[PDB]
């Protein structure tokens, strides 16, 4: 699992918003700098900036 | 005016969510009542997330 190092507010409908310290499962990381991630807290899924998270 | 140095996601009803680079005017502790010039929303923000 990965952890958010910063808050992130969605800038498009298919982004995932998240808070610093949120645990995230990376669901796809093969399409570029934005990874598809799943929030273990909220259950939501969406794209996130890969540089805002780090392996937990 | 103040600028957001970081994104902030609201954690309470009266918090203000904002994005890095958003311009804010403080209206009035460590949490300040701020008005977003970009979105028009008003709520409390962590004072250490913004800069003049």
């Amino acid at each position: 699992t990965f952890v958010a190092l910063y808050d992130y507010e969605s800038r498009t409908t298919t982004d995932l918003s998240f808070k610093k310290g949120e645990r995230l499962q990376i669901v796809n990381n093969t399409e570029g700098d934005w990874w598809l991630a799943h929030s273990l807290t909220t259950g939501r899924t969406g794209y996130i900036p890969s540089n805002y998270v780090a392996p937990s | 005016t103040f600028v957001a140095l970081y994104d902030y996601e609201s954690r309470t009803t009266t918090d203000l969510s904002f994005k890095k680079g958003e311009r804010l005017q403080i209206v009035n502790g460590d949490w300040w009542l701020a008005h977003s010039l970009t979105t028009g929303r008003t709520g409390y923000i962590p004072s250490n997330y913004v800069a003049p």
Binding site: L5, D7, K20 | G29, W31, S47, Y49
Partner: peptide
């Protein structure tokens, strides 16, 4: 990001 500060005293 910076640790969120304590909420305001009542």
């Amino acid at each position: 990001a910076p640790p969120l500060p304590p909420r305001n005293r009542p």
